[model samples]
Target chain A: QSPYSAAMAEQRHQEWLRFVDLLKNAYQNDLHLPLLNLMLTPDEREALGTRVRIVEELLRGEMSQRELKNELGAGIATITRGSNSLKAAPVELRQWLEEVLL
Target chain B: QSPYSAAMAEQRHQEWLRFVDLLKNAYQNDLHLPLLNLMLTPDEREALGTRVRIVEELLRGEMSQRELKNELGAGIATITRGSNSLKAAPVELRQWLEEVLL
Candidate 1:
């Protein structure tokens, strides 16, 4: 939905990949949190944290979408997005979340 | 910060680390971008992209903070936060950005 030219879009994709590589290296070396603490504003960090919790709650299947939305103080849009992610996630990841968070 | 008890804060911290671990695994398996696409809103992605560009421009040393703010339509707070991350980043990361983005 951006007005980016094909070349600019390609450039942005590369940039995103490079940033992910850096994050991966940081994760491997046990510096992920520190790096992310530097990289994200408190608001951004909180937003991501809330999204994870939404996914966790959805995985538990104990709450309706409306209940989850009210409990988490999140918009329906955010809850729906989290639900979509949970649905589309790899089975391995689903298993992992089920084990860790259930 | 909210009125989180120490225990709650610790739990949140662990949750953040778990999420990071998932991201690291995604990065390793070439699913980083796809995972992020699901986890983040479009506005979040754009916000992060802007931060990366802010850092890139800072690394290049071609613009004052004022110039960058005007050019990118970003807040001074965002610019300052990006600058702080640039300052505190590992030397290896500095070298890498210098090579790739400068």
Candidate 2:
């Protein structure tokens, strides 16, 4: 048996790939935002935007945690989660974030 | 402003483009799901799942709204919205959905 035997994980991976491909198609059709808006709740959209902003500010390294908390009105835990994700992210991802956000 | 003075729309478009590109790069590095999970709240994720399922079922054309309502416990309005979106979707998007979901 091949070492990785998580059948549920495999199924989920396939589903994710399909969903991502669907998203890619949506982008090509300029429907990505519309489709996502239809699916994501208003609160979710706001939170997602906040998460991106957190990552953006973190990547910029222009603000301290205290400054971020005061500016974004987000708690320390929220800021720390974004920081940890960025640090753990792949180099390519980090670079892409820098390119886009900076 | 070149007859298109909706500066807000332009700004939002630029932001959306950057976000989508970030997601694309995340997929390239197998970080898409992790990054999305980090950004999306649990309730948001569950709602999104329901929306996708609604679309998936509608696109499949295998279930009536009555059945869908009973099965998914979604309102008639939700079902109709998914139906409308699928009907109004670009041909390419419809085709891709069929290819992946069917």
Which structure among the candidates has the greatest TM-score?
1
Error of 2 at A31 (Å): 7.5
lDDT of 2 by residue, B1-102 (tens): 213548865654455556666776676666676567556654555556566778888877788868899977667788777777666666766776677667
* Per-residue alpha-carbon lDDT of candidate 2 for residues A1-102, written as tens digits (9 for 90 to 100): 213559855644455445556666666666676566556544555556567778888878888878888977667788767777677666766776677668
How many residue pairs clash in each candidate at the backbone level?
A: 0, 0
Please give the distance, in angstroms, between residue B76's alpha carbon in candidate 2 and its true position after superposition.
1.8
lDDT string for model 1 (A1-102, tens) is 235658878666666656666677677766676667766876677667777788877877788867876878767787767877777777766775566557
Give one digit per residue, the lDDT tens place, for model 1 in B13-55.
6666667776776767666766687678766776666666777
* Docking band of candidate 2: acceptable
How big is the positional error of residue B11 in model 1, measured in Å on the Cα after superposition? 2.8
- For model 2, what is the alpha-carbon lDDT of residue B43? 51
- TM-score list, all predictions: 0.74, 0.66
Which regions of candidate 2 are displaced past 4 Å?
A1-21, A24-50, A64-102, B1-5
Error of 2 at B51 (Å): 2.1
